[PDB]
From a paper:
The proteasome plays an essential role in protein degradation and is critical to maintaining cellular protein homeostasis. The mammalian proteasome core particle, 20S, is a large, barrel-shaped protein complex composed of four stacked heptameric rings, including two inner β-rings flanked by two outer α-rings that are each formed by seven different α or β subunits. In each α-ring, the N termini of the α subunits form a gate preventing unregulated protein entry and degradation. There are three types of known endogenous proteasomal activators that bind the 20S to open the α-ring gates.
One activator is the ATP-dependent 19S complex that recognizes and unfolds ubiquitinated substrates for degradation in an ATP-dependent manner. Affinity purification of human endogenous 20S(β4-StrepII) pulls down multiple proteasomal complexes, including 20S, singly capped with 19S, PA200, and PA28. The purified proteasomal complexes were first visualized by negative-stain EM, followed by cryo-EM structure determination of singly capped proteasomal complexes of PA28–20S, PA200–20S, and 19S–20S at ∼2.6 to ∼3.2 Å resolution, with and without MG-132 inhibitor. The conformational states of the human 19S–20S proteasome have been well-characterized recently. The conformations that we captured here, although all singly capped, are generally consistent with the conformations reported previously. To visualize what might happen if proteolysis was blocked, we purified proteasome complexes via 20S(β4-StrepII) by StrepII pull-down in the presence of the peptide-like inhibitor MG-132 and carried out cryo-EM analysis. Distinct density for MG-132 was observed bound to the catalytic sites of 20S β1, β2, and β5, consistent with a previous study of the yeast proteasome. Besides the 20S proteolytic chamber, additional density is also observed in both antechambers, indicating that MG-132 can diffuse into all inner chambers of the 20S proteasome. Inhibition of proteolysis by MG-132 does not inhibit diffusion of peptide-like molecules within the proteasome, indicating that proteolysis is likely decoupled from substrate movement in the proteasome.
Numbering used by the authors:
A (entry chain i): 2 to 251
B (entry chain h): 1 to 234
C (entry chain k): 8 to 241
D (entry chain l): 4 to 241
E (entry chain m), G (entry chain g): 5 to 244
F (entry chain j): 2 to 240
H (entry chain q): 1 to 199
The structure:
């Protein structure tokens, strides 16, 4: 019946879509997800949340998912919506591989999910998918690429971006310290740790609290390795060493 | 005569951005009777407290701990009828995997598939979100796996967890113990103790229902075995 | 204030259909006159700016060689109605090898006017009554004929009619000017005098479109350039 | 107030408001009069003109050789019912090779009208009809309301100012069975004359007369054809 | 208020108000009474004539649902005609599927289940009619059932529906229905209706009477005009 | 599926939802289109480059077919669906009635889709108004504008987006008979309109011009800067 | 605690409570009736109060006890029409179980299937939750006699003895004390315990006609509805 | 009946198609083009049934062009061959089967020249030199005898001429003129039509 109905897709008198804006707020509450692009490789690092001692941690990184051999994504937002979208992304990549026997390029995957996300806003009187995800991938057509998809269905190709709780602060640090045309994944990894230390209120950036995954092309194979906690620990110490060196300068 | 019915989601994003109906369903899980799940290195132990209001009710007729498959079992906190609908659905999903792959469903896989059904209710129209949170347990590839699925459909893997009345106190009680070096499932005693901490008048073989999943499989402990464990419970 | 797409006034007609009648009032004025020597159809383009080409605005269209339509209110809605009329005349030709009378074409568009209903029904014509007031004019076996329709779906045959904004003012003058045997030439001149009075802007050739269908000739292409000669006459 | 919005909702007084509002649509409509005689049935109608230049809208629509329907309500609704009635008579002729009994058609018309007045979303049909027919039983006149209740009537009137017509038809109802076609139309046009405001008068342009009888297939006499029926009338008693 | 908008809503008290409002419409309807005699059932309906111009038989509230079954309707006439059509159809399906005339107990239950379905959903309004079905069979004997808008079907030795339901049943209880012969029962039905008519609250009414029984050979039929009229004469004489 | 009318007439006689959809176009970034004697030109503004962001992904000018090209102002997501739907129709038009797609036909198709969303139950109207610029077989350059409601009008020059009114007034006042001509002058007229755009960044404004006998070419940022320098030189001449 | 239409439709409320389902429980009590069931060592007995308000209603038609299958019987407490519909759904599900699986439905399964139908009514709006509670009695091999109750909310459990209707808190307590010291009741004792519990809670000391008793026994598996005379012999025995 | 030959060299693909369209005993068009340009560097030539060839070829061509408009990059020759194979394969078990024999020639910036052979059954095989038609049975031995992996573009046109001459010396079908095209880094180039009016 009309009385028990939520408009969901109806336009505001202002002209904005109210539900989509509300969904964006949910992404803001979710944990920090940050991506930095370097010429050698593209990396996605996200902050683990609700790290209670009893959790098994057997999911091989809850935030990070591998959509295809050459593509990966991390999502901030309602977990249930994320699981539905991550499965859909994997199917779209596979369906392309069968129709044309070549891996999906990247923007095509982002646009295809984005088309679904917009469709929910467009019609059906149904709740929008309140999830925002960053896509890191390599393609023959345009090399390493990074993309961000909003709940609205609009997408972007940012070389460096953050979609988590402290996104405004992370982007400001990224804009100032990202060196365009300078690669070195190691420099990008250090920048990521510094952004994470600012974004995370908890000090010391504990290795368990953060997850880091790096996509690099080796021997023409594209390897989405996930950094081990020991690798994360050495990186945090390196950030501390730089902070200590600044203290020595002071 | 109304056919399929309402096609508009009853759950919608708040101005804050948190779905209100899912939060209300969480309240039913907290309001539910206490359920405790502990995973020991040999096997998971699922314990829930069933206190029938009167002697008239036959406790044996209904089991809160149920076997989804030979190696997978479920315990619930929240509305009872909804748990039965999920339990039937989970058994169908587990059998469909077996038919396609000719191998018993991996424990994690059942949770994702059950969770996907739970998420469907939240997005889909007319249906209210489920009011039940489950603590699925399984023994695939030797290692025991304990997982919890919330009404929203988010699934988390827990070495130990508790849901229902005084869940927070239960979580702290488990935090004090749960060293997780218990090669044997002596955690059956600890699970009885955590339910006992929030238990009301007494703990009896009828009062507590316990199901254990080991290398052998998921077996609901016999009422006599629950009495033996309830007896000499420290 | 949900009301309904289909709902009745306490003592009266459907509210949405009444609101649709209001939408025509915010529309380009069109005057249609029927004479023994043919039907004269006139309209005000109301071009908003010099940059837009005047030709792109079309308020007169050819449904068939002997039929033309004057439109008002929302132009976008008329496009579906115009196409149906053109398909309807063409299907009458394929089946009968004869020309549809103007009245039959009016009924076919008129039938689609009330086909809106939220539950079930047909998606293509739906949501709301069409916001348009067509003025079909044509020469058929009976003779030159002009017909007026409204979103309510009530077709009528009118010797002279005015539609859109200032229709009431145009109609009052139309009654006085109309004569028992006006020649088509007298009507084309009489209509443009009325068109100039109602329109705020000058009666420039770009501002007004007049097209006539006569027993001898097919619907003429808006009297291009010859329009200036009639404008020169006034 | 809340109860008035839908047909599905029932008032605390147990009356369906939307049905009553649909009933009003018939009242805001041109008056029509139906009479019957032992052998013939006449359905005079008062056509109303939007403008002097505009032609009066046609009220009596032929359904089959034996049946004709007057309309007093939203025209588009009447067309949907009239299309159904033409189809129903055609199917009866096609399968049973006989004219559909008029009463049986009225029964089908009611069942179609009842389904919207019940189901959610769908709106009550809002047209009042005065069907006239000839069958083995004989001449018939049937009134249909938007409520879906048919009523078999020897005479009838529906629409604005119809009450005056009903009073005249009731006073002279006894005379109707034993009269020739001319008299039956003459009583019927006199009934329309009562519906007409006193200043206005019956003219060939404003009156449509339709007659079905033992030897007459439904004929919608109008314009000049109406003039002999109009002639011989006593002056209106104003 | 605010819990009476839909029939898919239970009041905090524990009732479906929309069904109750539908039953109110039945109360507004004029009385129709059915009595089970020793050999058959007789139904009489008080239908007041709103307009003299109606030719009689207009809005008839007694319907021959099946050869052996007949119904008397009180409520919105439009809703009733639809119900009779469901009943006529359900009877026809039984004769085609199982090969014999439907038992009245089954027909009342099957029609009642349909009436019940409307109450459960917001989409469809509850029915506004309370018809009574009566049948006579040599094998099963005379049976009378009344189905109300809620969907409740109860077998009644005597029953009434409408504004004068209480007055009619009280007059009906005095009659010895179990032993009275059907022809004798007809005069009694006419008397009960004439007493409960109200005289000035309603305008002049026409008495519609139906006979199903051994006299009618197990076929529901309208009472013959000769059997009627004399029944009207007794009713007018009895009231005065 | 959901079957209730999202847009219903209000008592004033206006479809309120369609007006709200137009408001979304008003909030959209400005887009300017002019037709040259032989070279059709269209331009976009408010690139709002964040340095980290990549420009190719955010481009708001696309070629539906070799003959036609489009620019959009309004909700970005809605446009991506409408553009891809037009691309399918243009290729589908070739499969049926074999031939290229006339610019007017593609604008009618985009308009009909937009009108259908207003006249459909359960679907919110598209929030994009579009400038479709293309050359027909005759070679006459054609530019058309599609409203969110679904009305198409041929325009020799027009602009849509934030501050559309100011640019539209500037375009009519600055419009030159002969369409400026010389190709560079027609591009300059858009560059002058781009200067009229509020940001007036220079590099921030990006424009693409179709020869109308070849294929759409995006102006190189350095090439656009040289055209901006030509406008700056004209400003120096005015001084 | 109220949020939006939480109390107007079957949607969750603050505190995770389905108000509409709680209103449905009140509906069972709305009908002025009570029913009690007792499970003995060798037999299971169901008793109900039959109230015929007017003599005209046929006593046989007014029954709240129905036969789901030859070996399974039920007592319905709640709105009559809704209860009659649940009876048909249960009868159909048992027929399907026999056809599809080849053995008669276990009484435990019939309850779960009817309960599963009820839970969906709560889950999906557009369907009212239902206002009837059903108690099922049957003999199952290796389970002895069994009594089961299905709530409108869809809860199901096995019951040694139970009651539903207007006065059930009193009935459960009176039975609970008797259950504590029952020491396995015999068939006469089970009928006596049920009749006495109803007699005391209603405080009516009802005669045989006023109540209906249906019993299922290990010796006679077929569900049997006791005739009034058979009820009287048990009724006098408790009276002594 | 209709003849298609493809010879592939180090940096080029040479494709020749017959130009005869015949209904019954009469030959009705002698200028028929059996080559459809799916994209700038990919050409599909199809020989099969009277209406199946145009409908299948155009659908593949339009879809390949559409991918370029939306994506902005032309499909690689290989992907287009796999896409065509899937559509023919899906239709094989369908109410309307497509009886079309197709060979696809393309040049890719990285892969280089590619020639793909597809049967009506939709089996796709990449081949160095390939032929279709009854004519293929005589010509393919000549291609096998003279083909060398490294072959100049000029030598290929001569080899195409040698095989085309055998289609007049030892074949029952008139097959008078053959259309010749080459695909290379620049794009498809229409070499002069090889003709046998007697020259």
């Amino acid at each position: 019946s009309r009385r028990y109905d939520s408009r969901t897709t109806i336009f505001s008198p202002e002209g904005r879509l109210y539900q989509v804006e509300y969904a964006m707020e949910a992404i803001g509450h979710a944990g920090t997800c940050l991506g930095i692009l370097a010429n050698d490789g593209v990396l996605l690092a996200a902050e683990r949340r609700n790290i209670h001692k009893l959790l098994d941690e057997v999911f091989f990184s809850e935030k990070i998912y591998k959509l295809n051999e050459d593509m990966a994504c991390s999502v901030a937002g309602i977990t249930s919506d994320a699981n539905v979208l991550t499965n859909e992304l994997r199917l779209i990549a596979q369906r392309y591989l069968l129709q044309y026997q070549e891996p999906i390029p990247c923007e095509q995957l982002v646009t295809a999910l984005c088309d679904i996300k917009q469709a929910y806003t467009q019609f059906g009187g149904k709740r929008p998918f309140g999830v925002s995800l960053l896509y890191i991938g390599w393609d023959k057509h345009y090399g390493f690429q990074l993309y961000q998809s909003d709940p609205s269905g609009n997408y972007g190709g940012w070389k460096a971006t953050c979609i988590g709780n402290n996104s405004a602060a992370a982007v400001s640090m990224l804009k100032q310290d990202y060196k365009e045309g300078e690669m070195t994944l190691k420099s990008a990894l250090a920048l990521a740790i510094k952004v994470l230390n600012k974004t995370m209120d908890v000090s010391k950036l504990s290795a368990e609290k953060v997850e880091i995954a790096t996509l690099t092309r080796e021997n023409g194979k594209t390897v989405i390795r996930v950094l081990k906690q020991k690798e994360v620990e050495q990186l945090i110490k390196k950030h501390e060493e730089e902070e200590a060196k600044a203290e020595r300068e002071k | 005569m109304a056919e399929r019915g309402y096609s508009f989601s009853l759950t919608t994003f708040s101005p804050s951005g948190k779905l209100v109906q899912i939060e209300y369903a969480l309240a039913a899980v907290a309001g539910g009777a206490p359920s405790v799940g502990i995973k020991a290195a040999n096997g998971v132990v699922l314990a829930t407290e069933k206190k029938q209001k009167s002697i008239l009710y036959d406790e044996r007729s209904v089991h809160k701990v149920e076997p989804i498959t030979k190696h997978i079992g479920l315990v619930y906190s929240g509305m009872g009828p909804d748990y039965r609908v999920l339990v039937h659905r989970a058994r169908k999903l587990a059998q469909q995997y077996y038919l396609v792959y000719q191998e018993p469903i991996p424990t994690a896989q059942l949770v994702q598939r059950v969770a996907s059904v739970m998420q469907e209710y939240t997005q889909s129209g007319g249906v209210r979100p489920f009011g039940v949170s489950l603590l699925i347990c399984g023994w695939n590839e030797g290692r025991p796996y304990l997982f919890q699925s919330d009404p929203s459909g988010a699934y988390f893997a827990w070495k130990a967890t508790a849901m229902g009345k005084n869940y927070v106190n239960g979580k702290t009680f488990l935090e004090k113990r749960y060293n997780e070096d218990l090669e044997l499932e002596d955690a059956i005693h600890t699970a009885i103790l955590t339910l006992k901490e929030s238990f009301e008048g007494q703990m009896t073989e009828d009062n507590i229902e316990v199901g254990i999943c080991n290398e052998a499989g998921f077996r609901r402990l016999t009422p006599t075995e629950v009495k033996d464990y309830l007896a000499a419970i420290a | 204030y949900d009301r309904g797409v289909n709902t009745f006034s306490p003592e009266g007609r459907l509210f949405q259909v009444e609101y649709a009648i209001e939408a025509i009032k915010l529309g380009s004025t069109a005057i249609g006159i029927q004479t023994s020597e043919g039907v004269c159809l006139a309209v005000e383009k109301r071009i908003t700016s010099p940059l837009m080409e005047p030709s792109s605005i079309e308020k007169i269209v050819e449904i068939d060689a002997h039929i033309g339509c004057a439109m008002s209110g929302l132009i976008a809605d008329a496009k579906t109605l115009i196409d149906k009329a053109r398909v309807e005349t063409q299907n009458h030709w394929f089946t009968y090898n004869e020309t549809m009378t103007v009245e039959s074409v009016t009924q076919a568009v008129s039938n689609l006017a009330l086909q809106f209903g939220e539950e079930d029904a047909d998606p293509g014509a739906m949501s709301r009554p069409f916001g348009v007031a067509l003025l079909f004019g044509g020469v058929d076996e009976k003779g030159p004929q002009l017909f007026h329709m409204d979103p309510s779906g009530t077709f009528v045959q009118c010797d002279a009619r005015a539609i859109g904004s200032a229709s009431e003012g145009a109609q009052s003058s139309l009654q006085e000017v109309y004569h028992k045997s006006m020649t088509l030439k007298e009507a084309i001149k009489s209509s443009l005098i009325i068109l100039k009075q109602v329109m705020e802007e000058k009666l420039n050739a770009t501002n007004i479109e007049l097209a006539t269908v006569q027993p001898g000739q097919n619907f003429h292409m808006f009297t291009k350039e010859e329009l200036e000669e009639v404008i020169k006459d006034i | 107030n809340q109860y008035d919005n839908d047909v599905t909702v029932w008032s605390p007084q147990g009356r369906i408001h939307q049905i009553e509002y649909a009933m009003e649509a018939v009242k805001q409509g041109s008056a029509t009069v139906g009479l019957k005689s032992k052998t013939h049935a006449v359905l005079v109608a008062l056509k109303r003109a939007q403008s002097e230049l505009a032609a009066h809208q046609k009220k009596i629509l032929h359904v089959d050789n034996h049946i004709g329907i007057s309309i007093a309500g939203l025209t588009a609704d009447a067309r949907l019912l009239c299309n159904f009635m033409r189809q129903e008579c055609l199917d009866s002729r096609f399968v049973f090779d006989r004219p559909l009994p008029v009463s049986r058609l009225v029964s089908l018309i009611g069942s179609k009208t009842q389904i919207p007045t019940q189901r959610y979303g769908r709106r009550p049909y809002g047209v009042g009809l005065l069907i006239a027919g000839y069958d083995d039983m004989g001449p018939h006149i049937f009134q249909t309301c938007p409520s879906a209740n048919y009523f078999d009537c020897r005479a009838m009137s529906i629409g604005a100012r119809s009450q005056s017509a009903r009073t005249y038809l009731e006073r002279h109802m006894s005379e109707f069975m034993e009269c020739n076609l001319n008299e039956l139309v003459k009583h019927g046009l006199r009934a329309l004359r009562e519906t007409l405001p006193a200043e206005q008068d019956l003219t060939t342009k404003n009156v449509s007369i339709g007659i079905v009888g033992k030897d007459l297939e439904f004929t919608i006499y109008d314009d000049d054809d109406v003039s002999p029926f109009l002639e011989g009338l006593e002056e209106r008693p104003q | 208020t605010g819990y009476d908008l839909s029939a898919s809503t239970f009041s905090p008290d524990g009732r479906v108000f929309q069904v109750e409002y539908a039953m109110k419409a039945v109360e507004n309807s004029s009385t129709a009474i059915g009595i089970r005699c020793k050999d058959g059932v007789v139904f009489g309906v008080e239908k007041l004539v709103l307009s003299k111009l109606y030719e009689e038989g207009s809005n008839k509230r007694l319907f021959n649902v099946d050869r052996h079954v007949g119904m008397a309707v009180a409520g919105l006439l439009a809703d009733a005609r639809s119900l009779a059509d469901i009943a006529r159809e359900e009877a026809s399906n039984f004769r085609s599927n199982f090969g014999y005339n439907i038992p009245l107990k089954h027909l009342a239950d099957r029609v009642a289940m349909y009436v019940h379905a409307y109450t459960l959903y917001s989409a469809v309004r509850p029915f506004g009619c309370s018809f009574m079905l009566g049948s006579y069979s040599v094998n099963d004997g005379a049976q009378l059932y009344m189905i109300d808008p809620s969907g409740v079907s109860y077998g009644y030795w005597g029953c009434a529906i409408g504004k004068a339901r209480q007055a009619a049943k009280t007059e009906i209880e005095k009659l010895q229905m179990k032993e009275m012969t059907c022809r004798d029962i007809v005069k009694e039905v006419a008397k009960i209706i004439y007493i409960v008519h109200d005289e000035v609250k309603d305008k002049a009414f026409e008495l519609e009477l139906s006979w199903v029984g051994e006299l009618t050979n197990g076929r529901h039929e309208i009472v013959p005009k000769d059997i009627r009229e004399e029944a009207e004469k007794y009713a007018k004489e009895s009231l005065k | 599926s959901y079957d209730r009318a999202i847009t219903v007439f209000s008592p004033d006689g206006h479809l309120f939802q369609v007006e709200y959809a137009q408001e979304a176009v008003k909030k959209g970034s400005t887009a300017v289109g002019v037709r040259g004697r032989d070279i059709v030109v269209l331009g976009v503004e408010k690139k709002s480059v964040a340095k980290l962001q990549d420009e190719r992904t955010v481009r708001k000018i696309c070629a539906l077919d070799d003959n036609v090209c489009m620019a959009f102002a309004g909700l970005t997501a809605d446009a991506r669906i409408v553009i891809n739907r037009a691309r399918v129709e243009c290729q589908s038009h070739r499969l049926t009635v074999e031939d290229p797609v006339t610019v007017e036909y593609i604008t009618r198709y985009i308009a009909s889709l937009k009108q259908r969303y207003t006249q459909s139950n359960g679907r919110r109207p598209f929030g994009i108004s579009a400038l479709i610029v293309g050359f027909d077989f005759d070679g006459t350059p054609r530019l058309y504008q599609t409203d969110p409601s679904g009305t198409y009008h041929a325009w020799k020059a027009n602009a849509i987006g934030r501050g559309a009114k100011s640019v539209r007034e500037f375009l009519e006042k600055n419009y030159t008979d002969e369409a400026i001509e010389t190709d560079d002058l027609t591009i300059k007229l858009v560059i002058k309109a781009l200067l009229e755009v509020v940001q007036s960044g220079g590099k921030n404004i990006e424009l693409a011009v179709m020869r109308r006998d070849q294929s759409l070419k995006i102006l190189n940022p350095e090439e656009i800067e040289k055209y901006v320098a030509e406008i700056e030189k004209e400003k120096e001449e005015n001084e | 605690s109220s949020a939006g239409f939480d109390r107007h439709i079957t949607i969750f409320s603050p505190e995770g409570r389905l108000y509409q389902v709680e209103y449905a429980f009140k509906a069972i009590n709305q009908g002025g009736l009570t029913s009690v069931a007792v499970r003995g060592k060798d037999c299971a007995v169901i008793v109900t109060q039959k109230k015929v308000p007017d003599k005209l209603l046929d006593s046989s038609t007014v029954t709240h006890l129905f036969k789901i299958t030859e070996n399974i019987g039920c007592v319905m407490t709640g709105m009559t029409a809704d209860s009659r519909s649940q009876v048909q759904r249960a009868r159909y599900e048992a027929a399907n179980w026999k056809y599809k699986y080849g053995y008669e439905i276990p009484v435990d399964m019939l309850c779960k299937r009817i309960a599963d139908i009820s839970q969906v009514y709560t889950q999906n709006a557009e369907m009212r939750p239902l206002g009837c509670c059903m108690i099922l009695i049957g003999i199952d091999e290796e389970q002895g006699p069994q009594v089961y109750k299905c709530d409108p909310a869809g809860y199901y459990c096995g019951f040694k003895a139970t009651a539903a209707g207007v006065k059930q808190t009193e009935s459960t307590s009176f039975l609970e004390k008797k259950v504590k010291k029952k020491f396995d009741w015999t068939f006469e004792q089970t009928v006596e315990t049920a009749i006495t519990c109803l007699s005391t809670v209603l405080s009516i000391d009802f005669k045989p006609s006023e109540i209906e008793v249906g019993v299922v026994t290990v010796e006679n598996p077929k569900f049997r509805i006791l005739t009034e005379a058979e009820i009287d012999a048990h009724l006098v025995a408790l009276a002594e | 009946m209709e003849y298609l030959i493809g010879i592939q060299g180090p940096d080029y693909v040479l494709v020749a198609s017959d130009r005869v369209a015949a209904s019954n005993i009469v030959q009705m068009k002698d200028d028929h083009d059996k080559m459809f340009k799916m994209s700038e560097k990919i050409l599909l030539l199809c020989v099969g049934e009277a209406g199946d060839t145009v409908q299948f070829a155009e659908y593949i061509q339009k879809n390949v062009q559409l991918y370029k408009m939306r994506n902005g990059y032309e499909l690689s020759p290989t992907a287009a061959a796999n896409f065509t194979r899937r559509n023919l394969a899906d239709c094989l078990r369908s109410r309307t089967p497509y009886h079309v024999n197709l060979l696809l020639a393309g040049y890719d910036e990285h892969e280089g020249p590619a020639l793909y052979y597809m049967d009506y059954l939709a089996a796709l095989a990449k081949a160095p030199f390939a032929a279709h038609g009854y004519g293929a049975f005589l010509t393919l031995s000549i291609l096998d005898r003279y083909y060398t992996p490294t072959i100049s573009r000029e030598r290929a046109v001569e080899l195409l001429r040698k095989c085309l001459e055998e289609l007049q010396k030892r074949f029952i079908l008139n097959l008078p003129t053959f259309s010749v095209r080459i695909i290379d880094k620049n794009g498809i180039h229409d070499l002069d039509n090889i003709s046998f009016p007697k020259q």
